Design a protein around this ligand. Structure first.
Ligand SMILES: [Zn+2]
Ligand SMILES: [Zn+2]
Length: 547
């Protein structure tokens, strides 16, 4: 029913196997107007027409797993996700004609092969054919096509299609295969912004999150080798070759969580902010630098995100790893020695119970990093930290003074915002890592006469100017709950060509997004389940549309 149709002349389907394909469109998630959200378009490679059910379910699995990683997770409901059911003649594993002509080269890279059948523009198919048709017919902006993709434009072959990657935030191609591979193609100047990954490899979801991190977040391979020259130093979001801790771009994050610059391998001149990152080893999470940069990157594509507060931590303050000179050694063993010291000192998250009565007379530090997303509003955040008894009462010293301290932090504006992957950008060239960024550290001296009890813990809050709690001593370990969206007509029928996905939110979250006024051609009526604490897995938010 709902679909797009392409016209693929000899430059896109030289063997005539896909000269005029019909592509069913499935909406996996549309929580707001496309104009307000990041639009992701996923196509299948090597799925035959009878395998499109598998393709849809593969996309839902990969997408849901990607949304469990920060920083995506913080934006989970600000994506609209569409599955385009591109049908191949052959399965991928059978090796016959496929929709995207994908081959695996001698480096294990999946590549769209223009030379396979002589389709000279095959790897331009996303931004010249699929994208413009989708943006005209399906996307809420309905930008009418500007150029015939089977003709040579006057002037640039590329500029007429630049707009595609501003209305579609990411193209993904899922290959129907168990083969383990992955590749991301980011060259917007020449029209390329897609990645390819497999549906059923042993690490399929981790690979998907990684390639999406290259493609959408603009992060570099923390497995890369070589020395970054000054231009490439400024260009990289998450890599460096600057040995001096007083000069390295991410110096404000040094000592926060597992942020300790090190060589990404013995004797390497390529430096990473943490040895344990998915951008180097797909078994890990995103490091704090990648979370910050990716969160900043996505904030450019939506309008209502104005602050990043990394999850704060509390540590016994001994003076270790508290000054730049403590970070000068860049060997892997220095990274791990640092993380062991951090664990020995940690008093938050899963180490909250390490507090004890021997803590009197000691100092503790509440530490996080804050990025202002506004290029016009400076911010002032108030930090509170205190010693809490197990029953919730606030501990005191021997004079009845509560064991508590407060400090306010000024967050400067993001003056450099326009240089960091804004809408319309073709690349990231140079940005000031520290613009809008503020590492906040609140040190509390526990008095020698603290009246501590077994089971006491460190409590804390990060408050905004209205007193809203942005983060506290429960944030890091709080339970997340799964929510699933469904699209229905007034009469309870499921809307065709929808396949509502799930995502997760902190237990108790009240969802607050404004539904898109249209779904395909159907007009929105009402929604059940918004503005209501989400307190059970499988909670269903139901969007009702008028038939
Ligand atoms: Zn990679
Ligand atoms: Zn990283």
């Amino acid at each position: 029913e709902q679909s797009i149709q392409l016209t693929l002349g000899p430059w896109y389907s030289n063997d005539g196997k896909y000269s005029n394909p019909t592509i069913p469109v499935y909406t996996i998630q549309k929580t707001r107007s496309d104009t307000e959200n990041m639009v992701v378009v996923v196509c299948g490679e090597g799925y035959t027409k009878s395998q499109q059910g598998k393709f849809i379910n593969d996309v839902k699995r990969l997408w849901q797993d990607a949304m469990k990683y920060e920083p995506y997770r913080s934006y989970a409901d600000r994506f609209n996700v569409y599955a385009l059911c591109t049908a191949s003649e052959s399965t991928f594993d059978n090796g016959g004609s496929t929709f995207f002509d994908v081959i695996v080269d001698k480096y294990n890279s999946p590549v769209i092969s223009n030379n396979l059948h002589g389709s000279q523009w095959k790897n331009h198919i996303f931004e010249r054919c699929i994208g413009p048709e989708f943006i005209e017919k399906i996307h809420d902006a309905h930008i009418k096509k500007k150029c015939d993709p089977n003709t040579i434009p006057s002037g640039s072959e590329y500029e007429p299609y630049y707009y595609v990657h501003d209305y579609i935030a990411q193209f993904a191609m899922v290959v129907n295969t168990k083969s383990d591979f992955g590749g991301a193609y980011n060259n917007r100047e020449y029209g390329f912004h897609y990645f390819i990954s497999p549906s059923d490899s042993y690490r399929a979801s981790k690979t998907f999150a990684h390639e999406f991190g290259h493609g959408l977040l603009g992060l570099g391979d923390e497995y890369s080798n070589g020395y970054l020259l000054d231009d490439k130093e400024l260009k990289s979001l998450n890599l460096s070759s600057v040995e001096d801790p007083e000069k390295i771009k991410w110096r404000q994050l040094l000592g926060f969580r597992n942020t300790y610059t090190c060589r990404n391998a013995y004797g390497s001149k390529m430096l990473v902010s943490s040895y344990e990152c998915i951008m180097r080893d797909t078994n890990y999470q995103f490091c704090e630098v990648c979370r910050l940069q990716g969160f900043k990157r996505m904030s450019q594509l939506v309008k209502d995100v104005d602050l990043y507060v990394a999850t704060p931590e509390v540590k016994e303050y001994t003076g270790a790893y508290s000054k730049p000179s403590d970070f000068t050694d860049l060997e892997t063993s220095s990274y791990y020695n640092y993380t062991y010291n951090r664990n020995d000192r940690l008093l938050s998250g899963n180490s909250k119970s390490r507090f004890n009565t021997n803590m009197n007379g000691k100092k503790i530090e509440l530490r996080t990093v804050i990025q202002n997303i506004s290029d016009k509003n400076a911010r002032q955040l108030k930090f509170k930290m205190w010693i809490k008894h197990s029953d919730g009462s606030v501990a005191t010293d021997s004079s009845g003074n509560p064991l508590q301290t407060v400090q306010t932090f000024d967050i400067p504006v993001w003056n450099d915002k326009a240089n960091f992957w804004p809408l319309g950008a073709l690349d990231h060239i140079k940005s000031d890592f520290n613009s809008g960024l503020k590492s906040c550290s609140l040190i509390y001296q526990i008095p020698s006469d603290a009246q501590l009890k077994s089971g006491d813990t460190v409590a804390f809050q990060v408050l905004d100017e209205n007193g809203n709690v942005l983060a506290d001593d429960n944030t890091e370990t709080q339970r997340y709950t799964t929510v699933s969206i469904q699209y229905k007509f007034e009469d309870g029928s499921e809307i065709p060509n929808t396949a509502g996905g799930t995502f997760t939110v902190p237990y108790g979250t009240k969802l607050d997004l404004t539904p898109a006024k249209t779904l395909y051609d159907y007009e929105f009526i009402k929604v059940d389940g918004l503005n209501k604490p989400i307190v059970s897995d499988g909670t269903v938010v139901t969007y009702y549309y008028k038939n």
